Design a protein around this ligand. Sequence first.
Ligand SMILES: OC[C@H]1NC[C@@H](O)[C@@H]1O
Ligand SMILES: OC[C@H]1NC[C@@H](O)[C@@H]1O
Ligand SMILES: [Ca+2]
Ligand SMILES: [Ca+2]
Ligand SMILES: [Mg+2]
Ligand SMILES: [Mg+2]
Ligand SMILES: [Mg+2]
Ligand SMILES: [Mg+2]
Lengths: 570, 570
Amino acid sequence: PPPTEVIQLDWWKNCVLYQIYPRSFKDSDGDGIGDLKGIISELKHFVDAGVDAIWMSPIFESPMVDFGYDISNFYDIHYEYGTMEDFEELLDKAHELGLKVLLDFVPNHASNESEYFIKSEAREPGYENFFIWADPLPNPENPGVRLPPSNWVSQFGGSAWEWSEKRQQYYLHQFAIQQVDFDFRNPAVKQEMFNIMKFWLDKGADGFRLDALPYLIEADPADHEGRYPDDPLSGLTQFESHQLGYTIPLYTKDLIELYDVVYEWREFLDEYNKNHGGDTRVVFSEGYANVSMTMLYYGNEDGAIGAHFPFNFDFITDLSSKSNARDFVYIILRWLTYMPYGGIPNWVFGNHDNNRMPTRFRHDMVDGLNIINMLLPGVAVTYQGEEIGMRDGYVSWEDTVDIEACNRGDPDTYHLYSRDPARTPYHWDNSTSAGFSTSTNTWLPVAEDYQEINLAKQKETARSHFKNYQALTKLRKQATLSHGEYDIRALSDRTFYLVRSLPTHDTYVLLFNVSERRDTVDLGRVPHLTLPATVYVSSIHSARLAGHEITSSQLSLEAGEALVLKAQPI
Amino acid sequence: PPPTEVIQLDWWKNCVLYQIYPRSFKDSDGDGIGDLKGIISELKHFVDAGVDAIWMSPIFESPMVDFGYDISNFYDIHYEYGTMEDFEELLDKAHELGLKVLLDFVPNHASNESEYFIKSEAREPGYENFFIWADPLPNPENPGVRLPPSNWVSQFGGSAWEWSEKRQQYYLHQFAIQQVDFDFRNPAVKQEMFNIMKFWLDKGADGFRLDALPYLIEADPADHEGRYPDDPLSGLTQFESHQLGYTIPLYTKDLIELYDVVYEWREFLDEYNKNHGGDTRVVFSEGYANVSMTMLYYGNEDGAIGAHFPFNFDFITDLSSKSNARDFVYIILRWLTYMPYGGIPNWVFGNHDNNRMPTRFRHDMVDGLNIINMLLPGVAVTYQGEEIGMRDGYVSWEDTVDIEACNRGDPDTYHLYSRDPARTPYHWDNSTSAGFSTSTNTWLPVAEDYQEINLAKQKETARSHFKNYQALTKLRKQATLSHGEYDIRALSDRTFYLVRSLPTHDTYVLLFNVSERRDTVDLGRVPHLTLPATVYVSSIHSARLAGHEITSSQLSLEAGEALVLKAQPI
Ligand SMILES: OC[C@H]1NC[C@@H](O)[C@@H]1O
Ligand SMILES: OC[C@H]1NC[C@@H](O)[C@@H]1O
Ligand SMILES: [Ca+2]
Ligand SMILES: [Ca+2]
Ligand SMILES: [Mg+2]
Ligand SMILES: [Mg+2]
Ligand SMILES: [Mg+2]
Ligand SMILES: [Mg+2]
């Protein structure tokens, strides 16, 4: 039977999306700080890797308190990264190579060094109500003893309320003291968000990652007898009143009103795509929330439409080296069971806020994890370094610069909080500072294992994480991966299968031993697998090379061993 | 092609198992109390319903403090239910009809009126160490105040430690003061459990339900410097130190040592079966625990073999009227994903300790829930009344007799705790006391809806819960249900499918709208469903009767509506 034609999908429905952390990708000018000229110089890397789309962490003007998530000017480039002209060059060259480019949009908060905040604190007309400003809580017990409006706790520790001597009021910060929460009930704030997105779409951005959306809106004091209501206490004894986890964020996170803002953004974007034509511009939302609250980002039962997708963080939050094959299957099934019909699935294995994929799992699991990412239906999301199996870098207390570690931690505890280990410079090669920089003085220390783990080494050697990555992004061109069904089950506590099948097209089968022990399985239990079949990709430690023929229905897999098999059509 | 032949399964691998609560099934002698002669008089009901096996709640000599779970003689019958002769007659007549009969084995504890406890409290040789006896915790600062050995809390509220004046020590009771915990580190206790099981297997019992196994073993004081260690505090403000929920049962529940006892019971039972022949005698374990601790009842990765299965309580603990179709699918997938390879799955929708199925869900969902039970692979478990859709009965504070309600509750709270609503007498017909008794003075009040919900009415009327139950138990004789594959996915937030398929055999498809709203679905999305197909079973208010032909790919389902479709073989 001739292989059926499939209707090609819009680019965003099955792209490989790569997150760049610009400060740590490529330093072009020897200051130990990654920059836009650095990115331009290695845009060819994304073509070589089989990446369709890049999203950059924030590159806008910022005092760098939260390394770019504290934005003082939403309309220009951070000087350490380069100039507006460098950004326009990046977009032109990325587009020439057929890549899509997404920017990190940070709508929840602005730098306390923004004109928005300076004018708001000064009560200039039109800015007075731009942020959440609150009087001290009345103190009938001791009148005029200053109390915060409520018990709300910052994501970076301490009160979410900061006193302004100038304004004689508290402002809200869910993040750092320097990150001031906008009032999303103010129509002028909502207009300014459209102004920012229009500016960057007009420059030719292909869309946005939407930062920290669960924290957009907090309880209206009009609904709580003219005060900000206290969040419920957790009652967990390990947390004092200044420590994140002391409260349950009932009045400060996942408010139903936030989704109305997201649906308004999507309406604006749909209108922009209709009026401008060309490639669909998209929004992908960031929010760590339960399944119900996560799926509302897609849209609601009234038929409102939201983000093209909310990020799926399940491989960060719900799986690790403690997981067995049944855990892998049960967590993979969660997105696919709960996602609305017509929704596009996505898979995230890492980001700049979490430990690196091989550290959360094991070094011998890198290939199997990248195979899951690329072989599951929908969109594969890769964090800078996953394509070469980068591990967390050692960062001392002395070298730690993450506000979350510095605010929540001390020399003895900082490792529980710090995001710095996942932000160490990218391993290009075995030259000074792993080819990230010509300087030995990098903004974070280069990981100690860059001699063993670097892109140039993996491009030369016969078998590598990066060559596996390339083989997998290439496989995504096949109709079976773009349009095929999926079947996923555990064969044992150690090994699971994932079958992509499509009548008249080749069958692809992942077999993954996620355990630390050898496992023998009966391939006769795998649906749509006829033997003999051919190894397409194997873990770097597999006895099987690509082109190896599987003939026996009895298969032994070593600890961490993953195979992709190519089998005849069904 | 002619239909493939299937190998006969051992009876326990696909039985319909019905839980009888004897006190509430049938009263033969007008005292308002269900009894063995009553059960004998209605054994024909199980044949009529298509039940393969019955298990009875406890019928052994008991002061009835916990209505039979407080046993004073494990070797004789409770006088209110009948005599040993009545029990032997029940086994003879059940076996003559082809039924298996299992007993409720209560190994964790004995009545304080048992000879074991009387002798143990008297420090009689051979009995002194039969229960968990402990000295008060030293009170150096305040030696005039006796302290219990630890902060452990009873499942029925209050301290798990009761002072014995006679023995001048505390004994452990995880359940009622009158339910004394055996010492499962005592070889003499372990031998007595074999003696009890052998006694009843020798009488002709086909196996046991194993009661309350998570509570078998508690921390050894030898591991905690000669004291019983305190359970950790929950920190939940709604519970004071005498209230269940005050502690996390780290030292009192799910200890790894309990499974070694279960594996020893299975070894004993395998040897008994080997030495006796005839129908395999089985054990089904009761335990409410997390997934890991539940699956250890089947066996362990080292090859130990435990219960034939642990009960699956997921439709009690994890699904309700709050659940949508995606929840139904994700919870059904939990047992099927985590159960060990070669394990027999089972499905429990109710029991005498939980609210009745139609009360936990909705009255309009009874048929769909009975269809899930019967159509999923493995063993269907039915609690007395589910075959006619019995609802919780109203029980006033004055009529309440459940120790858990009387200990934990008051006239204002009792309803939060009481199990009595699920124990009201069975609805045979619309006669006095719904045909359960000739007496109006029933041990619990007959539910007010018995004239509307009763077996005789459902046998006379053209469409009924009972007639659907009969059709479904009949359907389980088909190779597609005994040996077929399964596929389960949600079509929407409201409707899911469950497909049973087997090459050369008819395909069976459940479609169930679990929502309170209508839903229209595309049957083209259902695997292995070729149209036209025939309605095999419909919910009692479905627009479609058994025999109705489904021709259109678009299907509108009412709230609660459930269909089983019969479709051509794959
Ligand atoms: O902007 C708030 C937070 N979202 C992403 C994190 O890196 C940042 O601190
Ligand atoms: O025997 C202890 C407990 N297990 C079953 C319940 O009905 C009983 O109270
Ligand atoms: Ca906010
Ligand atoms: Ca015990
Ligand atoms: Mg630089
Ligand atoms: Mg963290
Ligand atoms: Mg009676
Ligand atoms: Mg299939």
